[PDB]
Amino acid sequence: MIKLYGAPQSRASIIQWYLEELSLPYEFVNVNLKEGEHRQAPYLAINPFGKVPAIADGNFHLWESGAILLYLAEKASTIPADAQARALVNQWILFANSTLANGLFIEAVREKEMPRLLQSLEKILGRSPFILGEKFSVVDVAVGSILAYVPIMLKLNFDDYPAVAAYVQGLVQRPAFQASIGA
Amino acid sequence: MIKLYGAPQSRASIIQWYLEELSLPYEFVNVNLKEGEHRQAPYLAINPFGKVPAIADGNFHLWESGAILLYLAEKASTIPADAQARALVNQWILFANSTLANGLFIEAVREKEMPRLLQSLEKILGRSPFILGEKFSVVDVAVGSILAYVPIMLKLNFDDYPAVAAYVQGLVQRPAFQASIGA
Ligand SMILES: N[C@@H](CCC(=O)N[C@@H](CSO)C(=O)NCC(=O)O)C(=O)O
Numbered sequence: 001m002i003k004l005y006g007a008p009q010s011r012a013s014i015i016q017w018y019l020e021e022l023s024l025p026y027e028f029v030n031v032n033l034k035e036g037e038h039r040q041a042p043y044l045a046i047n048p049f050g051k052v053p054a055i056a057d058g059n060f061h062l063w064e065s066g067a068i069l070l071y072l073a074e075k076a077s078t079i080p081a082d083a084q085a086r087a088l089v090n091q092w093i094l095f096a097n098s099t100l101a102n103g104l105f106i107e108a109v110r111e112k113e114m115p116r117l118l119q120s121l122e123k124i125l126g127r128s129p130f131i132l133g134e135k136f137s138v139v140d141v142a143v144g145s146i147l148a149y150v151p152i153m154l155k156l157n158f159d160d161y162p163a164v165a166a167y168v169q170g171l172v173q174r175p176a177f178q179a180s181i182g183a
Numbered sequence: 184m185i186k187l188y189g190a191p192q193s194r195a196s197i198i199q200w201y202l203e204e205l206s207l208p209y210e211f212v213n214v215n216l217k218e219g220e221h222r223q224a225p226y227l228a229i230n231p232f233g234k235v236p237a238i239a240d241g242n243f244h245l246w247e248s249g250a251i252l253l254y255l256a257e258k259a260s261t262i263p264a265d266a267q268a269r270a271l272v273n274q275w276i277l278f279a280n281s282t283l284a285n286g287l288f289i290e291a292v293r294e295k296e297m298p299r300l301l302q303s304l305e306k307i308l309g310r311s312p313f314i315l316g317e318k319f320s321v322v323d324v325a326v327g328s329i330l331a332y333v334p335i336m337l338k339l340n341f342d343d344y345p346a347v348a349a350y351v352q353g354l355v356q357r358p359a360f361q362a363s364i365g366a
Pocket residue numbers: 007008009010011033038050051052053063064065066097277281282
C-alpha cells in the first residue's frame with residue numbers, strides 16, 4: 001500500500017482525504033517537524049527540500065501535494081486518458097497550489113486577489129455542485145481543501161459567497177473528509 | 184495553431200521559451216491588463232480567473248503556466264508514457280510554481296526558505312547538468328525561469344551556490360532563452 005509521509009496540520013491530510021475518497025489503504029508515517037526529522041538524511045532522501053507530504057508507492061517516491069493528487073487520480077483511472085483531459089485537472093491542481101493559495105493567504109495581495117478569486121469560484125459553484133460538474137473529483141480535494149482552511153486560519157467566512165459557503169460546508173461533512181482533515 | 188495569451192512581463196515568456204525549445208509555431212495574443220481587458224467577458228471565457236498566460240488549441244482552452252508547460256511537453260512526446268514518469272515532471276512543475284517561487288519571492292519567508300532551497304538545488308545541480316539528469320527538459324524551463332528571475336527582480340545573485348549559478352548562466356545563454364525571456 002501507499003506510504004504517506006505527513007505531520008500534524010500538514011497537507012498530508014489532503015492526500016489522506018483523497019485516499020479515503022478512493023477507498024485506498026495507506027500506511028501513514030509521521031515526520032516530527034518540531035524535532036527537525038524532515039531535515040535529516042532519511043527524509044531528505046525522499047524529498048530533498050525537506051517538506052511534507054511525500055508518498056512511496058513501492059520503490060517510487062513522489063513529493064508536492066499537487067503532483068501526488070494527480071498521480072493518485074491517474075492511478076485510480078478517474079481521468080479520461082488524453083493529454084487534454086489530464087491538462088484540465090493539472091490546471092486546477094496548479095491553481096489550488098499557486099494562484100488560489102497565494103491570493104487568499106498572502107496578506108499583501110489578499111485585499112485585491114481574494115474577492116476576485118471568490119467571485120469567479122462563486123459563479124462556477126452556483127452552476128454546478130462540484131468544480132468539474134456534477135461529479136466530485138480530485139479537483140474538489142485540491143481547491144476545496146484551500147477554501148475549507150479560510151475560516152480556520154484567516155477567521156473569515158463565505159457569507160457574501162453563498163455557493164462557496166454551501167460547497168465548503170458539503171465538503172467538510174463528507175465521511176472521507178471527517179476521517180482525515182476533520183479528525 | 185496554438186494561440187498564447189500573454190501581456191508584458193507575464194509568465195507567457197516562460198511558455199514562449201518552451202515553444203522556442205520545441206520549434207513550434209504559435210500566435211501571440213496580447214491581453215491589455217492596464218486597460219482591464221483580462222476582466223471582461225471575452226477573456227474570462229478563456230480563463231475565468233482573468234489571468235495570463237492561457238492557451239487556445241482549437242476549441243481547447245488551458246490556463247496556469249505550469250499546466251501549459253506540461254500540456255506542451257506531453258503533446259511533443261518529450262515525456263515517457265507512464266503515470267510515474269509524468270508524476271516526476273509534475274512534481275518539479277508544482278515545485279517551481281509553489282515551494283520554489285514562494286520561498287524566493289515572498290518577503291516574509293525569503294530569509295529562511297531561500298538559502299535552504301538553493302542549498303538543496305546546489306547538491307542536485309552539482310551531480311548533473313540539468314534537474315532530471317543529462318538531458319534538458321520542460322523541468323529546466325519551469326525551475327530555471329524562477330531562478331533566472333532572482334537577479335532580475337531581487338537584485339540578488341547565486342555567488343554562494345556555484346553549481347546553481349552555472350546552471351542559470353547556461354540556461355540564459357541558450358538561443359531559445361535569448362529569443363524569449365532574454366528579449
Ligand atoms: N507546495 C508544497 C508545500 C509543502 C509544505 O510547505 N509543507 C510544510 C508543512 S508544515 O506542517 C513543511 O513540510 N514544512 C517544513 C519546512 O518548511 O521546513 C506541497 O503542497 O506539498
